[PDB]
Amino acid sequence: NDYICNKYKNIHDRMKKNNGNFVTDNFVKKSWEISNGVLIPPRRKNLFLYIDPSKICEYKKDPKLFKDFIYWSAFTEVERLKKAYGGARAKVVHAMKYSFTDIGSIIKGDDMMEKNSSDKIGKILGDTDGQNEKRKKWWDMNKYHIWESMLCGYREAEGDTETNENCRFPDIESVPQFLRWFQEWSENFCDRRQKLYDKLNSECISAECTNGSVDNSKCTHACVNYKNYILTKKTEYEIQTNKYDNEFKNKNSNDKDAPDYLKEKCNDNKCECLNKSKCDC
């Protein structure tokens, strides 16, 4: 029947029995974490890629088993994302792309959350000293199959629900992780800021400012949630814009400033709320 996905579904079922399962953490409404001065996407925290240290030698001797472990991990990563987004297809599709590229970053050892998974992969692929060429070669050879494994994980996860976004090999694959994370941050900010603003609109209907603060407590709670989110996000935006301006802007033929980079990379008007009210009493 599904002859493209049979290879991946079969690798997935055979590996599922031996190894463990994903970490359920429901990252969707979580705040971004600062780890070693770096803002980390909530999605990245429990990305499904765990090398069992007692298996390093087997993966070193059997390249087919290592290829299979990566395809199974990428497939399972999609399943984890489907659970997190409650089957909202358009959200899973977009997040799959970021997870796929972070899988690439972890393999290549350019991941900014941790070096432990990357370290072990370096041993498996035989990389030496601090060199990453062996892992770069493996990524460029297997990345198209890895995306197919993820597309298959997606297909198992949602059979036919309508999804607007394209599913071709992600153009973001060549983009440095900081920039991908900044885009994810930006899209996530506009979406959540809207939802929190709707909650503020929904609870502050009959609410009025009398003798200082607002009368309705459910409205005050939505006001503080909104204000705390904006204060936090304004700071997260400055830290990211500062790193953008200092390390990326005017380098590698990129004369664009942060909002223009986002205007170019965010598709479907997702970052428009960037570069563009009744609680304070």
Domain ranges of the chain: 1-174, 175-281
What residues are paired with 38 via a beta bridge?
35
Give the closest residue to 242 by CA, choosing from 231, 256, 258, 255. Answer: 258
Return the structure tokens found at 61: 């001797």
Give the closest residue to 277 by CA, choosing from 209, 181, 218. Answer: 209
Could you give the C-alpha distances from 218 to 205, 224, 277, in angstroms and in order?
A: 11, 10, 16
As separate numbers, helices (DSSP H) first and strands (DSSP E) second, the chain gives: 10, 2
Give the closest residue to 47 by CA, choosing from 237, 241, 188, 181. Answer: 181
User: How far, in Å, CA of 9 to CA of 25, rounded?
Assistant: 25
Return the structure tokens found at 43: 């999605």
User: How far, in Å, CA of 144 to CA of 74, rounded?
Assistant: 12
Question: Is CATH 3.40.50.1860 the classification given to domain 1-174?
Answer: no
User: How far, in Å, CA of 137 to CA of 15, rounded?
Assistant: 24
Q: Which amino acid is at 30?
A: K
By what technique were these coordinates determined? X-ray
Q: Which long-range contacts (CB under 8 A, 24 or more apart) does 229-237 make?
A: 229/192, 229/193, 229/196, 230/193, 232/31, 233/189, 233/193, 236/32, 236/39, 236/185, 237/185, 237/189, 237/274
Name the CA dihedral angle for 131, 132, 137, 141, rounded to a multiple of 10 degrees.
160
The second-level CATH assignment, the architecture, of 175-281 is Up-down Bundle (1.20)
User: How far, in Å, CA of 112 to CA of 219, rounded?
Assistant: 39
> H/E element holding 38?
strand 38-40
